[PDB]
């Protein structure tokens, strides 16, 4: 299955952290390069809240890909569909709902 349909409530964290090659010379001078060839990928600290019955469906979706594999997702940040992978998806059960916390990492693949 390809697309992620659930929605993220609280306000996520979108961390970029570009990789650069940096050399620090002597009296205050330096030398910087973009290191890589294709931008930075960015990662989203996503949290879902779902009813106790749909949590099984969400778990099945996140377990089918199983750490590897990528799914399509349109983040509510730039509204540009991207390919992402999830590898942790911790989940806390409650009386009537389940709260998922996960880290979606964008991948070129």
């Amino acid at each position: 299955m390809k697309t992620f349909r659930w929605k993220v409530k609280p306000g996520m964290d979108v961390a970029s952290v570009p990789s650069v090659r940096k050399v620090r010379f002597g009296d205050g001078y330096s030398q910087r390069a973009p290191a890589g060839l294709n931008a930075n990928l960015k990662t989203y600290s996503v949290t879902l809240s779902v009813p106790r019955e749909e949590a099984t469906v969400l778990e099945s979706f996140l377990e089918e890909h199983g750490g590897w594999k990528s799914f399509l997702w349109t983040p509510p940040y730039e509204w540009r569909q991207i390919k992402v992978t999830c590898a942790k998806w911790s989940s806390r059960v409650s009386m009537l709902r389940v709260e998922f916390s996960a880290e979606f990492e964008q991948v070129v693949n």
Partner: protein
């Protein structure tokens, strides 16, 4: 941020490992972009002599008591 590049005063007693304080490097344990523990080859290359770094110091046969 920095490159430590350990020399000789650092290895001979931790008197100047704390001279640079190795603070931000140790807090960042290094990086994938850059490597620490460079271990400058100054005194190691010169142990046999300066003339050993320019010529390979041709060898001689073992001394035999037969002669």
């Amino acid at each position: 941020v920095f490159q430590i590049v350990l020399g000789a005063a650092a290895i001979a007693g931790s008197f100047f490992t704390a001279g640079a304080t190795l603070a931000a490097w140790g807090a960042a344990i290094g990086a994938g972009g850059m490597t620490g523990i460079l271990f400058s080859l100054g005194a190691s290359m010169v142990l046999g002599g300066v003339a050993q770094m320019l010529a390979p110091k041709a060898r001689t046969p073992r001394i035999q008591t037969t002669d």
